[PDB]
Amino acid sequence: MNIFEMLRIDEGLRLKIYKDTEGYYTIGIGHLLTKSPSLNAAKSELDKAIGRNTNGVITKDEAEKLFNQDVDAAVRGILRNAKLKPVYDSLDAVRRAALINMVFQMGETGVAGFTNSLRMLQQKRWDEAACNLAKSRWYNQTPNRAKRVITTFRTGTWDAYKNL
Ligand SMILES: *SCC1=CC(C)(C)N(O)C1(C)C
Ligand SMILES: [Cl-]
Ligand SMILES: [Cl-]
Ligand SMILES: [Cl-]
Question: What is its EC number?
């Protein structure tokens, strides 16, 4: 298991534009296109992202390319964020992956706002952090995925992902 395999499990793989859990146009492995309710706007973003006239369909290689860029962006974002960097730096590789997962799903600013959870993580108060993380819109809207990510932070193991 690794951050790529983890996010692949959590995000799935779809080669045609689809709506994500929040109802936003997405493609590939959780590649958010736009928050706009316009399918045309989403197709424009897609074409720009891929560099060709796609008309809402991409190949597996293209999906994997956007995925690689998105994972890189999440990591890059964590490192440039004053709140996220110290937490990330303090964690082991498995827990680092859990933090990248959250950033991939909700964005740098979103995760940076989890002030209390971040402090507990920094303090290595694993059970306390896990309890705090669940007190969120995140957990309530995507509980199965949040449970996996939280288990990863609580245990520092890939237990939540090994049978998936
Ligand atoms: S958040 C910690 C916690 C409190 C209580 C309601 C007793 N629980 O079942 C858990 C372990 C979730
Ligand atoms: Cl998804
Ligand atoms: Cl992009
Ligand atoms: Cl879920």
Answer: 3.2.1.17
